[PDB]
DNA sequence: GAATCATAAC
């Protein structure tokens, strides 16, 4: 360990980072939220990656589910903002990870088109989508060309507008707020 | 000049 692709695990056992804890996972503020609102859900029990995922992980998909909306609700009830929850096709980071993201994209660390497509495009892989997808097949179905995905034109996920440049998209979404 | 991309990080 040390080792950046750990990082994950090295904060979810810091109790300071825990935003929500209980039997099944553990919910952290993503480090370099990609919107206002931006955690993680992990479950204790270690699972490596999405490929890795049978029937026996369906109840704990369900749950990370159900735990990700309370989040909201406890911490993000006060908001108007919409929500997405979902996962990564190609993840980085060690350890599986539920996104649990608002959709205002609103935050200094989205600085490029990666993290964009990452959450706008079919790369980021819907909760219950997932979920259905263990119970009809009892695995985990990727399509290819993920990698391209992330190098798609930057496209407003409110007005569906081309935008050029992460600035100017940026710019774009802060009217979107009102 | 500004933004993006490619690549290393000892
Ligand atoms: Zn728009």
Not at 13 to 21: G, I
Not at 43 to 70: F, N
Not at 89 to 114: E, G, R, T, Y
């Amino acid at each position: 360990m040390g080792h950046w692709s750990q990082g994950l695990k090295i904060s979810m056992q810091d109790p300071k980072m825990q935003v929500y804890k209980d039997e099944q996972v553990v919910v952290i503020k993503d480090k370099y939220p990609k919107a206002r609102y931006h955690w993680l859900v992990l479950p204790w029990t270690s699972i490596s990656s999405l490929k890795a995922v049978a029937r026996e992980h369906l109840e704990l998909l369900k749950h990370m589910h159900t735990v990700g909306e309370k989040v909201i609700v406890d911490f993000a009830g006060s908001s108007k903002l919409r929500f997405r929850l979902g996962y990564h096709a190609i993840p980085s980071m060690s350890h599986v990870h539920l996104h649990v993201i608002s959709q205002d994209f609103d935050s200094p660390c989205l600085k490029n088109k990666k993290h964009w497509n990452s959450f706008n495009t079919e790369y980021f892989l819907e909760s219950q989508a997932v979920i259905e997808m263990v119970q009809e097949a009892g695995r985990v179905t990727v399509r290819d060309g993920m990698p391209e995905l992330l190098k798609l034109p930057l496209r407003c996920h409110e007005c569906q507008q081309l935008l050029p440049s992460i600035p100017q998209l940026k710019e774009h979404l802060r009217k979107h707020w009102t």
